[PDB]
Assembly symmetry: D2
Homo-oligomer: 253 residues x 4
Amino acid sequence: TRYAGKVVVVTGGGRGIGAGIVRAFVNSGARVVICDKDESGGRALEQELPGAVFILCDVTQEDDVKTLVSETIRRFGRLDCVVNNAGHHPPPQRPEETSAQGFRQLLELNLLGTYTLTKLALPYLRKSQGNVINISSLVGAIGQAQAVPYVATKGAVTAMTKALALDESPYGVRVNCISPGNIWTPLWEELAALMPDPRATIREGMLAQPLGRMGQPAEVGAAAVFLASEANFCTGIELLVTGGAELGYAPDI
Amino acid sequence: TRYAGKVVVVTGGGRGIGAGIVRAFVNSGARVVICDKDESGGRALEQELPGAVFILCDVTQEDDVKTLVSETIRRFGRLDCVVNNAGHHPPPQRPEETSAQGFRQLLELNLLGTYTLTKLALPYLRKSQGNVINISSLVGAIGQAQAVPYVATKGAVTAMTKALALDESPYGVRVNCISPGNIWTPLWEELAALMPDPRATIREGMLAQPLGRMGQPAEVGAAAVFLASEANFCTGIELLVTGGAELGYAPDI
Amino acid sequence: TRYAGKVVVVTGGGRGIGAGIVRAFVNSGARVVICDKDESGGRALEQELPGAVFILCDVTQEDDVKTLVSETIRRFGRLDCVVNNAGHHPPPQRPEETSAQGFRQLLELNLLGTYTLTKLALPYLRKSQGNVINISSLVGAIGQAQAVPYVATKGAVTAMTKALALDESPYGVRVNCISPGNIWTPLWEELAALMPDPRATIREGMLAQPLGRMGQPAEVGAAAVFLASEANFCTGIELLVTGGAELGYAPDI
Amino acid sequence: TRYAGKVVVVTGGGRGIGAGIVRAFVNSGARVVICDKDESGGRALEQELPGAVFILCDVTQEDDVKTLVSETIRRFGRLDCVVNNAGHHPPPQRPEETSAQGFRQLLELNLLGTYTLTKLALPYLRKSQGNVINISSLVGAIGQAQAVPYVATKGAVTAMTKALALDESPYGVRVNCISPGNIWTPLWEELAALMPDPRATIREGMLAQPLGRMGQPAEVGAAAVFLASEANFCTGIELLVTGGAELGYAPDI
Ligand SMILES: NC(=O)c1ccc[n+]([C@@H]2O[C@H](COP(=O)([O-])OP(=O)(O)OC[C@H]3O[C@@H](n4cnc5c(N)ncnc54)[C@H](O)[C@@H]3O)[C@@H](O)[C@H]2O)c1
Ligand SMILES: NC(=O)c1ccc[n+]([C@@H]2O[C@H](COP(=O)([O-])OP(=O)(O)OC[C@H]3O[C@@H](n4cnc5c(N)ncnc54)[C@H](O)[C@@H]3O)[C@@H](O)[C@H]2O)c1
Ligand SMILES: NC(=O)c1ccc[n+]([C@@H]2O[C@H](COP(=O)([O-])OP(=O)(O)OC[C@H]3O[C@@H](n4cnc5c(N)ncnc54)[C@H](O)[C@@H]3O)[C@@H](O)[C@H]2O)c1
Ligand SMILES: NC(=O)c1ccc[n+]([C@@H]2O[C@H](COP(=O)([O-])OP(=O)(O)OC[C@H]3O[C@@H](n4cnc5c(N)ncnc54)[C@H](O)[C@@H]3O)[C@@H](O)[C@H]2O)c1
Ligand SMILES: Cc1ccc2nc(C(=O)c3ccc(F)c(O)c3)ccc2c1
Ligand SMILES: Cc1ccc2nc(C(=O)c3ccc(F)c(O)c3)ccc2c1
Ligand SMILES: Cc1ccc2nc(C(=O)c3ccc(F)c(O)c3)ccc2c1
Ligand SMILES: Cc1ccc2nc(C(=O)c3ccc(F)c(O)c3)ccc2c1
Ligand SMILES: OC[C@H]1O[C@@H](O)[C@H](O)[C@@H](O)[C@@H]1O
Ligand SMILES: OC[C@H]1O[C@@H](O)[C@H](O)[C@@H](O)[C@@H]1O
Ligand SMILES: OC[C@H]1O[C@@H](O)[C@H](O)[C@@H](O)[C@@H]1O
Ligand SMILES: OC[C@H]1O[C@@H](O)[C@H](O)[C@@H](O)[C@@H]1O
Ligand code: NA
Ligand code: NA
Ligand code: NA
Ligand code: NA
């Protein structure tokens, strides 16, 4: 009952972290709108979860997002929390192999899609004293190899979260982000499968954490439910869900 | 039921943030040992809360802490979480008014008391796959005026949390900290009362947060229950409970 | 002589921080290419400074940047340091007053212009074991009110700096950023002039720093010369030039 | 001539990083007082460097530090910069192998010695508009394995630097810290020699940095001269000299 009576939109909710966040909110008593550009996972999740419904929406398309918000309000009468989870990590790319074109496309998804939904949702979040949760990335803070565009987009999300928290504080709307590290999801599996030795890549990904494993969508979901339902004095925070990966680390020429 | 069957020790649990943490854990289903050097608040809290008991213990006294741990195990049979909350903020002091003697005394409480209980508790936390929660301070990260010793002690706590998280990760024990900002507690009230215009000082303390108020012990308590019970992929994190105080901020000579 | 024989490109070098960086590098013995989209300041600076030349270049235009690099190499035979300083802060804008269109345009300048020049320069920086210096912003790290797009762009720059530092480390190219706070420049003067009480706004800007004044272009310039010429074990750092602005900060409802 | 006419005290200046800092300041034109508890290195350094003199002083002994300051003023007539470099890293120690006694002793050196000299020097630094430079450690920020006391002491130093910067800003005294990573010094060599395979330990220490080597005392020294002589808008900063070590990092159970 921690979030009973509330209405939550989760973008990219059809699989991976997003689906874990959907499940955590349904388990907390909320009604959840699953937004995804892909019908397969999200439609099945609606059938599985009473309290969740699926709305096809590509967050890079402004009119899709307008309809997502208007349909959420039409169907459920309020909006309490937006979780901006839709995002992508390209395959590893050396800096000279990236392009401004690809960088712009990744900004459209990872940054501007979050911006667009948040902007359209904020009038309703102000009415409900609701909150925004952005899914950023640990590597926005610490960097990652072979990922210049991705890292830039996530540094932008974390910073934007802090700016918006300042602007929306007088109106009672909290704005926070979660920065996951290595979470075992279909994206992780897909990227590993591109590598010469996928099993070795996966093993390395597990050992990057002091805890010796990758994280689960459910663990990101629990962090999101905490931020929405019990973190009433938290705004503009970056909540790390990383298993400790950021901890620790002639001869001098 | 989020933490049912678990046993938690909260130091400085007789009033303020510590009492809020005690209440949050009792509400989650845990049994709680209230440690305090002062009988008044903690004894009343035991009477009030089924599931909480009071043990007199000054965390700066090694034998008191040894007895705290042995009595917790004798009475409850396990130990799952230690919350190192006991600590103090001296009245505002200019650097030249501080002393090495006073600095050492504050280190004994704010830093070494946390170290001592954690060390004595860790064998039991390893058996239960339990966790440590240290109550640090936002100003350990960002500084504060007229508080050189206090700030130093809290920078030490936050750093120590990260080091211990690394060391205890192979054993399945997570170690995290909460960094509160301005929380309305008897300590805050006592410090304000020393100032020339206490009401003005309190007003200034409220407006230091974008949220326009100070935080509550209950909000720190909810963050602690989250870290203990649902943050299984979080270790070595600093969870800010500050209301956004860290956000934002000839002419050039 | 600290940077004698070296060749430096400074974008946005015609006024403000960029001109201060140009002067600092000329004073260190380097030859400097002043890039700017505006001829007025940069052309005068060339006439004033032996060792500096002006090249008209809008960093948002890929062909302009290609020509900037090819002309630098044609005229000077090497390239040792790129300082990505061109950038803009829009007038204060509430989140609901911003647009995706304006956000994209600001990303083109503050983020993608930095990306584009860095990419085109890197083959030459690898040959010289040179370095990249990005001018980010303190508010990328801590947030700012009425500046969601700006803050996002600068969070991206700081993060991108760390990612590129990782990628270019095997090749001996260091990549660092400077995050200024309030620096008294024509941009600051222009933004203040839009406000109802410009003098009051300027006074507030000075008092945001514990040092009680704004910074100077020359101080950012000295930090840049340090990073280029003497910081050989620094890569991926964020060097704050802020005057301490990030330091420090019923009642509980 | 960057720091000509100025007087600098470097603690632990007889070898390692401290000796590198001494050399960098002498090369900048300053007169330097080498403080050390060990005569061997510091006495030889005085003989070698015109402009440097050696004063025997154990920074944990208050009367030694009082004499250090009074002798500096008696001999040189002013004091412009204090570099608190004396410190120690114990051999790797598991948390259960540490003691409160050893922790207190390490606090006396790494934290309280810095506090004591700074306090005694500040009246003179206010007269000269001088500055304080504390040598902290990257692992104060990110943690390290088998080093709970050390990490705590360095977290305290970094935090204390920020608090004192706030307090001394109205008086025109800047207070900054440098956080080195792996620097090749006699301490590093001594710790490696205790390990089963010292050469393997050294190799691992080099590869912890993206730059693929450890740092040099001279590089820390250049950062110190920058902070003293050219960073006039920097106070309360943590300048990382780490080679990038902090950058970057069933399957989910
Ligand atoms: N998996 C990790 O290790 C990891 C680490 C750090 C951060 N993250 C972040 O977590 C989020 C989720 O990652 P994941 O691993 O679950 O990814 P995933 O690819 O498994 O799932 C992403 C989901 O988002 C949907 N989506 C993609 N583009 C969309 C669009 N334009 N509109 C709507 N939906 C869209 C996909 O169809 C998919 O269902 C992303 O923001 C990612 O950057 C993931
Ligand atoms: N109140 C704030 O704004 C604030 C802000 C940041 C951090 N904190 C931290 O939160 C913690 C609690 O602060 P608070 O405001 O509730 O303080 P408080 O003074 O109201 O309560 C502290 C409690 O700890 C007990 N205690 C003190 N010394 C002890 C000792 N040696 N052994 C055992 N118990 C001892 C006291 O008797 C008291 O019951 C402290 O670590 C403090 O530094 C508080
Ligand atoms: N002034 C501050 O307080 C402050 C604070 C933090 C960061 N910064 C950053 O410092 C940098 C310089 O700021 P400033 O205050 O000196 O600004 P400014 O407006 O005074 O100077 C910027 C210069 O860049 C040039 N420029 C703008 N767009 C360009 C383009 N497309 N191509 C090439 N040149 C272009 C302008 O013509 C101008 O000469 C910017 O990145 C800014 O975001 C400034
Ligand atoms: N070497 C590294 O990798 C490294 C990394 C991070 C931080 N640091 C810090 O840099 C500083 C210097 O380290 P180093 O590697 O050069 O060490 P080092 O042991 O080589 O040199 C330390 C010097 O300080 C002196 N000293 C020790 N105790 C003293 C006391 N009580 N009073 C006066 N002088 C005293 C020693 O005699 C010696 O000359 C320390 O604060 C250390 O924690 C070093
Ligand atoms: C082969 C490969 C490369 C890079 C990958 N990166 C991620 C990722 O998104 C991520 C990971 C850790 C972080 F700390 C983080 O912030 C993000 C996932 C799978 C990968 C697979
Ligand atoms: C007159 C006064 C002065 C300083 C005080 N400081 C605190 C405190 O402990 C605290 C506050 C904010 C933080 F961000 C923080 O980390 C700690 C409480 C009451 C005070 C009253
Ligand atoms: C009226 C106004 C509003 C906002 C302004 N902001 C800046 C700026 O660029 C900046 C400032 C501080 C920082 F810490 C920072 O990172 C950036 C300059 C002038 C302004 C004038
Ligand atoms: C065998 C061993 C173990 C640990 C050591 N640690 C240091 C050290 O002081 C240090 C290193 C990196 C940092 F990032 C840092 O902050 C400090 C030096 C030698 C060592 C040798
Ligand atoms: O594909 C990797 C993992 O992705 C997660 O989102 C699913 O919940 C797991 O069942 C699956 O093993
Ligand atoms: O004394 C200030 C506040 O302290 C808190 O710990 C109590 O829960 C409040 O009831 C009280 O108003
Ligand atoms: O316009 C504000 C300031 O801008 C700086 O870039 C110039 O160097 C100053 O002379 C001027 O006062
Ligand atoms: O002992 C390791 C290193 O220590 C440094 O302080 C010295 O300057 C080097 O010559 C020496 O190789
Ligand atoms: Na359903
Ligand atoms: Na009871
Ligand atoms: Na010229
Ligand atoms: Na000499």
